[PDB]
């Protein structure tokens, strides 16, 4: 459902399977993060389900051994000479060695300034060892980390707990239509996108011959060219698009390794799963309460956060003794308004706006034998309709699906194809809907802050800064103190600086923070883009130095003072709050957990095979499960009759189920409960 879920699904180091250990057999200890994971396996990106600690993911810099034992590159400090030597080792190649601190006052002479450096001893023990004694030093930061984890600025300010949530959610983003690059990200995104294949590349240098939405010809400097045929509205493995938009120019020289098209969630060749939004985490009248979120409705009307959802219904007409299910517009007993957007050849018109229950494909079948009821006999004798002995096993959009129809992919036996023994028509009709967001849709930031939208009101009641500006996004504060996750606020403020720009004044000398704060970080202009390594980033003091010069975007407005906070005026009241209100720029994205997907309703559907009990699933009409652990509270309430209802007729009494149907088709109170089938099936089981 996104380029990441394509990539990071690979580079997965699973613990289960043949030769692997099953979950129940998989005890507590094995789930742990062994010291031997440093650099090998990502210590943070693990599933948070029952596989916490079992399923693992690669690091970034890792390597695959010819044997397949994990290999990680590292420098080796010899006599206090940390060598550029990229020496690959595995775990047992440490116990006769010593790995040192990764970021020390290394003079570039290969020595450590301080003797006592925090190294890892042979057994994995991490302590101080003299400068010249340890033998190995790490390669570099963001070596022990994966890629998806490497897209969280201020990971070092974020709880390892929540970091897990953020990393796993980055795999669940949905393909939007803009994919704004983070104003604040990490330098790995640009690398991590092209490597994902979801970004079209100029495999070979040479001039861009031409640019088009369907292809892009790169005329190589030597005679030949390279024609790139693009992939548009190709449904994803999870019912989404693989849209690959071009960001190139009709003549510009493209290099070996430069973009040809951005993908679903990329821009300028770096990962871009969402949008960059100004914040104020003030709690707004109990509609963003307890993980509920309120947004600026501009973003909805702009569709800044909105997702295209392709889907396919598969319609398979096979060979039968009834005959064959001739998909045409030969519908038994069909009205007029229902054929309006349908083409004669048995499907909808390609580009038919369709809805829930809407008939999509007429997969008409013969019906079979039955006693013609005398009433219907009189009817066909009275008004003059036909027997209509055909069982229309057509497709109607099942519960809660809609949207335009893309088209059809049809294979057929008369087409002389490889269909299996019987299936004479394989059809794949495709329906898309760009689900404009709504409450119940799960959104999330890059630091684990997540949740469904409680509500989104128009821009009218939006507090504004001293720039007269209503803000993008409003969240609840109370999640922040109790989740060690001021890190998203750290990125918030630094993104403010990266959106307004700055000029750290080296008026008389580089400012004290600015000195070991690298060069050209003293300079920045509004609406800019930056990165921050997971452990080696924009330290707290550095950011304090980034607030000093807070040169605005347009007006004369330095809102975040040198220490951090800003002032806001309510957009409802027009009346000021007692204290300054926080603001700044946050990356946000939409998660693939829509309330358009997770609702199931059922008065009465089909029933199980053995028992008369309902079935399970949203696909099948299914039915809800009422467990024993619900029965416990159910009696603790003392509500016996409702429980008899639950297990007797609401599940398993056939005739009563019809009785209650009779009850509330007669407009009468539901009468005395019957005795149910599965109970009698229980008896049969027991007997």
């Amino acid at each position: 459902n996104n380029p990441l879920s394509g990539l990071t699904h690979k580079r997965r180091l699973s613990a289960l399977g043949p030769g692997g250990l099953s979950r129940e057999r998989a005890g507590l200890e094995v789930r742990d993060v062994h010291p031997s994971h440093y650099g090998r396996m990502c210590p943070i990106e693990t599933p948070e389900g029952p596989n916490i600690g079992l399923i693992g993911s690669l690091s970034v810099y890792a390597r695959v051994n010819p044997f397949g034992f994990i290999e990680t590159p590292y420098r080796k400090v010899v006599d206090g000479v940390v060598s550029d030597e990229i020496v690959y080792l595995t775990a047992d190649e440490e116990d006769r060695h010593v790995v040192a601190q990764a970021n020390s006052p290394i003079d570039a002479d290969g020595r450590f300034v301080e003797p006592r450096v925090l190294v890892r001893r042979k057994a994995g023990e991490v302590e101080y060892v003299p400068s010249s004694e340890v033998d190995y030093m790490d390669v570099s930061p963001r070596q022990m980390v994966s890629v998806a984890t490497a897209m969280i600025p201020f990971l070092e300010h974020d709880d390892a707990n929540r970091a897990l949530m953020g990393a796993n959610m980055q795999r669940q983003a949905v393909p939007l239509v803009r994919s704004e690059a983070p104003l604040v990200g990490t330098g790995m995104e640009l690398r991590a996108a092209i490597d994902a294949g979801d970004v079209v590349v100029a495999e070979e240098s040479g001039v861009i011959e031409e640019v088009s939405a369907d292809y892009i010809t790169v005329m190589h400097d030597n005679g030949t060219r390279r024609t790139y045929r693009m992939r548009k509205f190709a449904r994803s493995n999870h019912g989404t698009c693989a849209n690959q938009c071009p960001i190139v120019d009709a003549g510009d020289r493209v290099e070996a390794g430069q973009v040809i098209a951005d993908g679903p969630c990329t821009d300028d060749g770096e990962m871009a799963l969402g949008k960059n939004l100004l914040v104020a985490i003030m709690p707004w009248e109990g509609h963003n309460y307890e993980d509920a979120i309120i947004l600026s409705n501009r973003l909805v009307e702009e569709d800044v956060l909105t997702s295209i959802h392709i889907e396919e219904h598969e319609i398979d007409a096979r060979d039968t003794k009834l005959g064959a299910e001739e998909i045409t517009r030969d519908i038994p007993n069909i009205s007029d308004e229902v054929l309006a957007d349908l083409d004669e050849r048995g499907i909808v018109r390609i580009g038919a706006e369709v809805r829930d229950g809407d008939i999509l494909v007429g997969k008409v079948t013969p019906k079979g034998e039955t006693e013609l009821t005398p009433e219907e006999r009189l009817l066909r004798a009275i008004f003059g309709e036909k027997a209509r002995e055909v069982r229309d096993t057509s497709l109607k959009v099942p519960h809660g699906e809609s949207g335009k129809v893309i088209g059809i992919r049809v294979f057929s036996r008369e087409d002389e194809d490889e269909l299996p023994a019987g299936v004479n028509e394989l059809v794949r009709v495709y329906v898309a809907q760009k689900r404009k967001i709504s409450d119940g849709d799960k959104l999330a930031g890059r630091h684990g802050n997540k949740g469904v939208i409680g509500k989104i009101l128009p821009v009218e009641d939006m507090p504004f800064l001293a720039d007269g500006t209503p803000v993008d996004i409003i969240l609840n504060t109370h999640g922040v103190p109790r989740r060690m996750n001021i890190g998203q606020i750290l990125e918030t403020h630094l993104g403010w600086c990266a959106h307004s720009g700055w000029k750290v004044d080296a008026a008389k000398g580089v400012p004290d923070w600015a000195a070991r704060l690298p060069d050209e970080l003293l300079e920045a202009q509004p609406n800019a883009i930056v990165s921050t390594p997971v452990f080696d980033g924009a330290q707290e003091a550095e950011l304090q130095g980034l607030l000093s010069c807070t040169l605005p975007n347009r007006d004369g407005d330095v809102l975040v003072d040198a220490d951090g906070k800003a002032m806001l005026f309510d957009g409802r009241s027009g009346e000021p709050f007692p204290y300054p209100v926080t603001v700044g720029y946050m990356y946000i994205m939409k998660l693939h957990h829509l309330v358009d997907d997770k609702i199931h309703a059922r008065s009465t559907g089909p029933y199980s095979m053995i028992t008369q009990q309902p079935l399970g699933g949203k696909a099948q009409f299914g039915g809800q499960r009422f467990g024993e652990m619900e029965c416990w509270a159910m009696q603790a309430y003392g509500a016996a009759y409702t429980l008899q209802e639950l297990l007797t007729i609401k599940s398993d009494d056939t005739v009563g189920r019809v009785k209650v149907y009779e009850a509330i088709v007669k407009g009468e109170n539901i009468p005395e409960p019957g005795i149910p089938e599965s109970f009698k099936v229980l008896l049969k089981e027991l007997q």
Partner: peptide, 21 residues
Amino acid sequence: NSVPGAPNRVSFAKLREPLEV
């Protein structure tokens, strides 16, 4: 940087890389 098409994404890096990604 070290990429034929990347934009300038300035950062606060403290050390250089004996090897790339």
